[PDB]
Amino acid sequence: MQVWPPINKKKYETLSYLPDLSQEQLLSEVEYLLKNGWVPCLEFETEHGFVYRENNKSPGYYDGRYWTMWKLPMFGCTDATQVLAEVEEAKKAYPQAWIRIIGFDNVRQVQCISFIAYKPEGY
């Protein structure tokens, strides 16, 4: 019988309970977005990697949900390698940042994908 660690097990939502995605698996996820017609986009954060509540504590309000956009949503992107290239460039510029790939759906003005692609040292 093992005890689940109360520390050093911070998560980043979808897929974060699985072993770190290999470049090949990371690439397969991006192809799922493209196959469905979803517009890929990258987001990164350097300071607050997890949600907190500093400005308000009313129901539904949390700070730290929004991260900063890396460039622009990749409309018309057909090659999943173009997306993977940006992740390399992003962590090159900000190695101490968390980076995630999000997907947008148009029939619905919604976001429908969000998984971590890179985590800083000790995370």
Binding site: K11, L15, Y32, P59
Partner: protein, 457 residues
């Protein structure tokens, strides 16, 4: 009283503003279908055996329900489907209470019928616009919670009734810290000698905030606000708002539509998500010959208001029953659902942008059911576990971890192009390699399905 010559109108062309009803009629022997269907329409509108002077001070043909079509049921004999049309004016705007009173108020007790069952209702866009609907709905909810690309996960705190406020909170923290998004107050748990509501709300808030701080993910606990009076119900929601928690809960059928609409309005105005439990539904929707099918009770909830609604389980069901379930699941989530008798959808339903409701799947769900559930329901669903978390050998947290890992393994496999239908068991097998928690939860299952075990390297 010969209704047939006044209420049975096969030449009637339904209007865009009419409320349509599909009744499954089982008339008494000797009573013709046309007369039975006319009795159904008559009783649920003007209800007149003959004529009184007051009927001349208005136009009877303006407020009457009309049976415009009859269809014999393929299977059993003596069973017909009667289609009735009701004028938009018969109904009070924004009141599900009035809609149910007019349509199902007296007809089920008519003597000429042996049994009666309301199968579906076509809610026209003009009536839909008079309702607020879900406080938030699927999209806004995912945005508030910042959760995308996978079904949400919840678990029930057991036993149903019996635990104290602090022990309740302890189980809440352990489950949530392990990977689950939500924990649930039992539908029976309101305020009792063993645990008063305010103490529960207080300890559960402490527990959910700790798990959120520990994991970095937004957590929620359905705090049951169901109560004896409207005032108590609101008083309970007000405290949830003061604590700053994200979601409250209500038993809409035992609490009632009038009280539920009030809570839903309150939740919209105060940013609270509303989880709905369907307690008591089976006394109304189980028998195929008499009652109201769940798809109508689900439509009523979406109009009255709720962000989540329990919609049973698909595990161990014949396609058949499974198709009926997917039928009402679409009616709850989608904006436009086209007519399809194969899935029990008697009418095309246009929801005119009314927010969709997140279906909650619960009932004997285990980790090895994850592949089938993820495939059948898709991402927009909440999968709830009871003994799959609490019954895990190592406890709540490891039990929550097992379910979270199992779900993510299914999502990853699906995204990679794998067929969850035929590779389901294998997907869970591979996952057991990298998760001691998942492995321990799959022991008895491995012995039967794979005749072993183990790992290798």
């Amino acid at each position: 009283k010969d209704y047939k010559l006044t209420y049975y109108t096969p030449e009637y062309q339904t209007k865009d503003t009419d409320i349509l009803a599909a009744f499954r009629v089982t008339p008494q022997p000797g009573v013709p279908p046309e007369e039975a269907g006319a009795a159904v329409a008559a009783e649920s509108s003007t209800g007149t055996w003959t004529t009184v002077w007051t009927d001349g001070l208005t136009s009877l043909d303006r407020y009457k329900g009309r049976c415009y079509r009859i269809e014999r049921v393929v299977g059993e004999k003596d069973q017909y489907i009667a289609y009735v049309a009701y004028p938009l004016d018969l109904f009070e705007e924004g009141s599900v209470t009035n809609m149910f009173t007019s349509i199902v108020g007296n007809v089920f007790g008519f003597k000429a019928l042996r049994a009666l069952r309301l199968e579906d209702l076509r809610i026209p866009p003009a009536y839909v616009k008079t309702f607020q609907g879900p406080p938030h709905g699927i999209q806004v909810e995912r945005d508030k919670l910042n959760k995308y690309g996978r079904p949400l996960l919840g678990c029930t705190i057991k036993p149903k009734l019996g635990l104290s406020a602090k022990n309740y909170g302890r189980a809440v923290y352990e489950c949530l810290r392990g990977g689950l998004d939500f924990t649930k107050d039992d539908e029976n748990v309101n305020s009792q000698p063993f645990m008063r509501w305010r103490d529960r709300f207080l300890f559960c808030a402490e527990a959910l905030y700790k798990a959120q701080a520990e994991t970095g993910e937004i957590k929620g606990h359905y705090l049951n606000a169901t109560a004896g009076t409207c005032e108590e119900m609101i008083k309970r929601a007000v405290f949830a708002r003061e604590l700053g928690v994200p979601i409250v809960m209500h038993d809409y059928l035992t609490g009632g539509f009038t009280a539920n609409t009030s809570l839903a309005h309150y939740c919209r105005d105060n940013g609270l998500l509303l989880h709905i439990h369907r307690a008591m539904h089976a006394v109304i929707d189980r028998q195929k010959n008499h009652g109201i099918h769940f798809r109508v009770l689900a439509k009523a909830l979406r109009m009255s208001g709720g962000d989540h609604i329990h919609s049973g389980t698909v595990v161990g069901k014949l396609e058949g029953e499974r198709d009926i379930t997917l039928g009402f699941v679409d009616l709850l989530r989608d904006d436009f659902v086209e007519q399809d008798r194969s899935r029990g959808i008697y009418f095309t339903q246009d929801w005119v942008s009314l927010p969709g409701v997140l279906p909650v799947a619960s009932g004997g769900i285990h980790v090895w059911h994850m592949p089938a559930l993820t495939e059948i329901f898709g991402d927009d669903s909440v999968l709830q576990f009871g003994g799959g978390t609490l019954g895990h050998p190592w406890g709540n947290a490891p039990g929550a971890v097992a379910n979270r890992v199992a779900l993510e393994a299914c999502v990853k496999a699906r995204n990679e192009g794998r067929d969850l239908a035929q590779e389901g068991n294998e997907i869970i097998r591979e996952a057991c390699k990298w998760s001691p928690e998942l492995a321990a939860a799959c022991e008895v299952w491995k012995e039967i399905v794979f005749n072993f075990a183990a790992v290798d390297v």
